[PDB]
Scaffold this active site. Structure first.
Site, short mmCIF file in Angstrom:
data_model
loop_
_atom_site.label_atom_id
_atom_site.label_comp_id
_atom_site.label_asym_id
_atom_site.label_seq_id
_atom_site.Cartn_x
_atom_site.Cartn_y
_atom_site.Cartn_z
N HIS A 1 0.82 -1.21 0.11
CA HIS A 1 -0.12 -0.15 -0.01
C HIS A 1 0.68 1.26 0.10
O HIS A 1 0.53 2.41 0.43
CB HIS A 1 -1.09 -0.04 1.27
CG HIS A 1 -1.82 -1.36 1.16
ND1 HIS A 1 -2.23 -1.79 0.05
CD2 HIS A 1 -2.40 -2.01 2.35
CE1 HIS A 1 -2.92 -2.99 0.47
NE2 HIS A 1 -3.04 -3.20 1.86
N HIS B 1 0.29 -14.58 11.29
CA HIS B 1 0.80 -13.51 10.42
C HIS B 1 1.61 -12.71 11.21
O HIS B 1 1.75 -12.79 12.50
CB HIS B 1 -0.42 -12.81 10.02
CG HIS B 1 -0.81 -12.92 8.59
ND1 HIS B 1 0.30 -12.98 7.43
CD2 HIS B 1 -1.84 -13.49 7.87
CE1 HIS B 1 -0.50 -13.26 6.46
NE2 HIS B 1 -1.62 -13.76 6.42
N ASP C 1 -6.75 -17.92 -2.73
CA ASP C 1 -6.03 -19.13 -3.28
C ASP C 1 -5.67 -20.03 -2.10
O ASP C 1 -4.87 -19.58 -1.28
CB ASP C 1 -5.28 -18.86 -4.25
CG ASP C 1 -4.22 -20.23 -4.67
OD1 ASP C 1 -4.73 -21.23 -5.42
OD2 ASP C 1 -3.16 -20.03 -4.25
#
Ligand code: CL
Ligand code: CL
Ligand code: CL
Ligand code: CL
Ligand code: CL
Ligand code: CL
Lengths: 363, 363, 363, 363
Positions: free
Chosen positions: D19, D91, D326
Site C-alpha cells: 500500500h 501472520h 487461493d
C-alpha cells in the site's frame, strides 16, 4: 567497515590494549600461495618504535611459509595520587568513561598507540601483495614538525621529483626525524629540543606517496579511493586532518592552471597526465599517477608538565607533571601511515579485479 | 560501508546519474513512528541549486505521514565535435573508461553532482532524528573562496563564538555566497566575478559545526567519529581535504596550550572543556562539545575556456571552450556537507545507544 | 556477514586450523562492564570433545574480570602412502585445491571441526549477555542418529513439554549420546555400536530450543531471525539441512490447524499464542514464544574403511582404511549449535534495542 | 548482509510494501557492459503471479541497453469490523506492533509477498551474468504440496536424471502447479481443490537445481555457499526449512554409501564425483556438480475461514472469514527461489574471482 574491522574483501580485525595479554589482528581474505613468514612483517613493526620485544608470531593461515587462503592471526605479546583523579586533558579518558562507563586503570588502553600493531602487521601483508601486483611503492616521511615545515607545494617541481623518487631506505637513513630535507630537518631537531627542555610536546605532518598504483581502484560513490584513504588515516590516533593532491592550498589555484592535461606517456604505452594536481585520483578512481597526501598529527596530550584541570568529581586542581615523555612522536607514525595506505589499496584492487573479471565475461 | 551504501545501522543506498530516468536512494533502518513527509526533505534539497523541478517523492516506508520502520525509497525525477574526443582534464572521464570500459555519453554521469541528491534526501531524515535526539544543530557555511578566506583560526574567540551561534537561516540570508562574514563575503563576490570574466573557475572551503552532539558517539578503532566524518566528506565530488578541530594549523601549537582542560559546566550538570582544540572528539569519541571541521573543494574542472589536451586516441589538440558554467560551485555543497554529517551522526548514535542498552543489562 | 566474520553489531572474527599455532577469535562489540573470565567460556568449550588441553586464554578487552568494550581476543593453543594421493571422498580436500590451489598437508585444515573453537568461545559471551537480558535459555540435544530418531513431532504435547523444560544439565546427564529420550537413546547406542564394528560412520540430527527470547528480534527482509539462524547453522561443518517450527512436515497441515491463535497469557502480562507451529518467529520477527529448530548433520566422510576413489592425478585406486575414528560425532555439535544460536540472538537484540531507543525519541 | 541489503560485492538493497507508491531495489556492483533492458527482467517477474500491471522500469545504471557499472534502480509501480481488531493468526501483524509499534493498516505490508519484487528484479540481472560466466542453469519446481510429494530421494536415479535435465520451459508447460511429475501433479490438483472447497490453505516444498556452477564458490567459515543459500531461502516469506544434497534423510545413510567417490569425467577434462550426495558443495565450496536443494513453505495463514483468536485488547472472539484467497501459493515462489539462488551465486563468483586474480599475482 565496522568498529575494529577494516576492509571489504581484504579484511583485518584487530584487538588489544597495552595492559592486556597480547595485541594483534586477524587478516581475512589474503590470496593463497603468497610467501609469508614473520620476516615479511617484522621490518615495518620494527620501524614503529625507532631483547627484541615487539615480535610478531603468525598463528594461522600459513603452512611452509605460504598462505593457505584462511584467516591469518598475528600477535605481539604484551610485556607490560593522580591516576583516576583527573581525566588527562585532550586524552580519551573522559570519553571512555562516558561511552563505556569504564577505562583502563592507566595508559589510556585501546585509545593509545599500541592498537596500531594490528594495523602494521596487516599492512605488511598488503604491502607485499601490492608489490607483486604492480610494483606499488608506498613511502611516507615527516614533512612538518610544528612551525618547521617542508616546502610541500604540490606545484613545486623539486617536491614533485622527491615524491617520484623517495624510498623507504632513504627516509630512515636521515635519522629518527625521518625528514628527507637536510636543511628543514636540522631546523626540526632544534625545535624538538626546544620543546624538550620546555617539558612540552609538538605536533607534525606526515606526507606519503603511492607509486605505480593500478588504474581503476576506488568504489564510488562512498568508498572512493581518497575517501577510504581519509577514513584510514583519520582513524589513526592523534590525527587532526587529511588532504591529498593540491589539498587545501590548491583551492586558491584557478581551473585553467589547476586542471591536469592529458598526454601519451613518453615510454609510449598509456595516457598519462602532464600535472598531478588531482593527486592520482579523479572521480574517486585512481588514474595510475602518483598518489600523495599529508596527515596532520596533533601535539601529544601527555606532556611532562603541570596542568590545571578539573577532576572526575569535577573540582579544580593541578595535574602533576608525569615527566618522562618524548616531545615529538610524529615520526613514529610514518610506518603506520604506510601500513594504513596498503590496506586500503589491496582492498580496492581485489574489488576492482572482481569487476574486471565480470567485465570480461559479460562482454 | 560498501560502494554506494553508506552507514551501518542507519543505512542509505543511493543510485542515479544525470542522463538516466531518476535519481534517489533507499534509507534502511529509520526508527518507526517518525513524522516524515516530503516537506521534511525538500528544504535541504531545495537548497542544493540556489516549475519546481527537483521534487522528492517518498516511495515506501511511510504511512499517514509516519515511518513504519521498513526501507524508505525516495526519488527526484530526471528532467534531462568535442564529445568523446578528449577526456576533459581533471574530470572522471578517463578513469571511468579505464575502470568500467565505458562512460556516460556526456555530463560525467555518476561522477557528477547529481548523485548527491540521494545524500541530501537521506540526510534530511537523519537531521530530524538528531533534532529529536538531543536537539543537534548542523550548520555549514563557506569560509574560503580561492585566496579570499575567513579568519577561521580555532583559537580565535570571535570565530568560536560564531560556530556556537551560527544558524542555517543566517547563512542563507547573506545571499548565494553563504559566507557569514560581511567583509570577507564582499571580497568573495569580487573574486568570483574576476574569474567569471576570465572564463575560469575557483575552489573554496566549507566549514561546518555540529552542536549538542550526544556524548559517546564513535566506534574505535577504525569507525571513529572523525574518521567516519572524513570518509563522508572526502567521498563528496571535488573534495581535496578534510580537517577538524585545530586541524593542520594546530600542529604548530605546543601541548601546554593545545590541550583542552576540563571544568564543570556553568549550568552545572556535566563536565565540559575550557577550550575545544580537540574539535569535540577525543580518542574517536564525541565529548559533547562543538564539532567543527573544514572541507576543501577544488576548482571546477569544467571551465568556459580552451585547454590543450590529448585525445583518447592520444593526439595533442585543443579542447574547445564550452562556455556556460558558473565559476564558484562551492556554496552549492553547503547542504550536502550538512546532510553528510547528519548521516554519520545518526548511525553512530544508534550504535552507541545499542551499547548503552547492553551496558544497562550486564551491569 | 563476511568470510570468517559473523554478526553486525556483536561481531566475531575467527581464525585457526588444526596444524597451525593457535585457534581463536576476536569478539567485537561486547557491552562493557560484563563479568567475564575464562570460567565463563571453558564449560561450553569443555563440552566440545566429551592435562586439560583445550583451554581458552582471554587476550584483551577485559580488566579485573570485567569487559571494557574493546575487542576481546581469545585463543586455544594448538597441541598438534595415501596422503595427497587421493582427495578423501566427501571431504573438502579437492574443493580447497580448486579454490585456493593448496590444502593443508593433512587433517583438512580450516574445513575441519577445530575452527568451531572460535564459535564456541564467542558464543559463551553471547550466552551470558542473553541471560542477563531476559533470562534466555538455549538448550540443544541429539534427537536422531541414523534411522533411530526421536518423536519430535511439533504438534506432540509431550515433545513440546520437553522443549519447554529441557536443560543443559539434563542433556549431559544421560551420557555422551546427549539424547534426553531413554528408550530412543538405548536404540541409539545399539546403532552406533553396529556402525562401529562395521568400521562405518552415521549421521544425526540436533534439535535446539530457545526460551525467553525477547520479542522484536530479527531484521527483515534478508536478516530475518530464522534466516540468520539458518545461515548460522548451515555454516557449521557437515550440516545438510535446517528447519524450524513445524518445518518440512508442517507443510502437510492445513492452515486451519497449522495457524497459531493468540491469547492473553495465564500469568496475565502479555499476548501469547495457543500453539507454536510458527516456531516463535512470525514474519522474521520473534514473538517471545519458544524457538525450536533441528539441524541435520551428515555421516562423517572419514570412515575407518576402504574406498574406491580416483587420485588427483585421477587414476582409479583404493584409499586405504585409516581405521581410528568414532562413528557418530553428531553429539559433539550440541554445544556448537547452542553457541551459534547465542551469537545470532545477541546481535539481533542489540540491533533491535537500537531501534527501541530511536522509537522512543522520535515519538 | 544488513537488514534489507543482500550480498557483498554484487549487492541488492530492496524497498517497498503493498500500500505504498512503488516497490523495487537498487543493484550495486553489476559488471559494466552487460546487455540489460527491461526484457531481461520482466519474464521472471511475469512468472511471479501466474493491462500488464507489474512492469519494471530501469531507473539508472544503464545507457543504450548496456550497464555502466553504477547502481541500477528498478521499480514496479504499486497499483494498490475486523481490521486491527485481532492480529491475524500466524501472520506478522502482532510482531510488527511489538517491534515497530505500528503495522500497515492492512495487507501485512513489508512482511507480505510484494517485497519479493526487488528480489526477482535483481535476480534477473544475476541470472544473465551467471549464464555468460559458465552457462549456469537455475531451475526450480514444486515437488510437494501437503501430503502429496514427489519421490525426491537423492539416491534415486530417475530423480537425479530429472535434476540434470529439467528446464524452466518444461516446468511452466505443465500448468500453474509447476510440478514436472504428471502422476504426482494430478494428485496435487486434487488436493488443492479439496482444500479450496474446505476454504483452507496448504503448504508445499520447492526443489531447485543449479547446473554448471563454477568450482570454488563459497566463503568459509561463515559465508559458505550452502550457508548463504540457506540464508537466502529462509529469508523468503513463509519458508520453514531448508536442506540440500542428501538433506535430512541422508543422515540415515552410512558413510560407506553416503560418501561421493571421485572419478575423471567421461568428457575427459576434470575430476568429477560418481555420486552427488554432497549436493555440489563440499566444505562450503562448490565442486562443479549439480547443486540441488528443497525449501519448505508453510500453509498460508490467510484462510477463507473463521478462526477463534484474541484481540490486541486481548479478548476472545471470532475472526470472520475473509473468503477470497487461493489455497496453494507455493508454485508462486518458484521464480523467487530461482532469483534468490542467482543472487548468492553471482556474489560468490565475484568474490572468488577476486581471489583467483590475487592467486595469480602472488604466485
Ligand atoms: Cl563487515
Ligand atoms: Cl607501543
Ligand atoms: Cl553492508
Ligand atoms: Cl544537479
Ligand atoms: Cl578438535
Ligand atoms: Cl504481489
Amino acid at each position: 567497515q565496522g568498529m575494529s574491522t577494516f576492509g571489504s574483501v581484504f579484511r583485518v580485525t584487530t584487538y588489544g590494549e597495552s595492559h592486556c595479554k597480547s595485541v594483534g589482528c586477524i587478516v581475512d581474505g589474503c590470496p593463497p600461495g603468497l610467501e609469508l613468514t614473520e620476516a615479511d612483517i617484522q621490518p615495518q613493526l620494527s620501524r614503529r618504535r625507532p631483547n627484541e620485544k615487539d615480535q610478531v608470531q603468525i598463528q594461522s593461515g600459513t603452512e611452509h611459509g605460504k598462505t593457505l587462503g584462511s584467516p591469518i592471526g598475528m600477535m605481539v605479546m604484551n610485556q607490560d595520587s593522580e591516576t583516576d583523579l583527573y581525566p588527562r586533558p585532550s586524552h580519551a579518558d573522559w570519553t571512555y568513561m562516558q561511552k563505556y562507563g569504564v577505562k583502563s586503570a592507566s595508559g589510556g588502553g585501546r585509545s593509545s598507540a599500541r592498537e596500531t600493531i594490528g594495523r602494521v602487521a596487516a599492512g605488511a601483508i598488503a604491502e607485499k601483495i601490492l608489490k607483486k601486483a604492480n610494483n606499488v611503492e608506498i613511502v611516507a616521511f615527516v614533512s612538518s614538525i610544528g612551525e618547521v615545515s617542508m616546502d610541500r607545494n604540490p606545484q613545486d617541481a623539486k617536491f614533485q621529483q622527491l615524491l617520484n623518487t623517495i624510498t623507504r631506505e632513504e627516509v630512515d637513513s636521515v635519522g629518527p626525524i625521518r625528514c628527507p630535507d637536510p636543511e628543514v630537518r636540522e631546523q626540526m631537531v632544534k625545535v624538538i629540543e626546544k620543546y624538550r627542555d620546555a617539558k612540552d610536546s609538538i605536533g607534525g605532518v606526515v606526507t606519503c606517496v603511492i607509486r605505480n598504483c593500478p588504474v581503476g581502484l576506488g568504489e564510488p560513490c562512498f568508498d572512493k579511493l581518497e575517501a577510504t584513504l581519509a577514513h584510514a588515516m583519520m582513524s589513526l590516533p592523534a590525527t587532526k586532518g587529511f588532504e591529498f593532491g593540491s589539498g587545501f592550498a590548491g583551492t586558491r589555484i584557478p581551473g585553467s592552471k589547476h586542471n591536469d592535461p592529458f598526454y601519451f606517456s613518453e615510454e609510449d604505452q598509456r595516457l598519462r597526465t602532464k600535472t598531478n594536481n588531482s593527486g592520482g585520483v579523479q572521480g574517486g578512481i585512481s588514474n595510475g599517477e602518483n598518489i600523495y597526501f599529508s596527515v596532520a598529527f596533533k601535539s601529544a596530550a601527555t606532556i611532562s608538565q603541570e596542568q590545571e584541570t578539573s577532576t572526575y568529581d569535577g573540582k579544580d586542581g593541578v595535574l602533576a607533571a608525569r615527566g618522562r615523555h618524548d616531545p615529538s612522536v610524529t615520526p613514529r607514525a610514518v610506518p603506520i601511515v604506510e601500513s594504513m595506505a596498503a590496506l586500503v589499496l589491496v582492498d580496492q584492487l581485489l574489488i576492482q579485479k572482481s569487476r574486471e573479471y565480470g567485465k570480461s565475461i559479460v562482454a
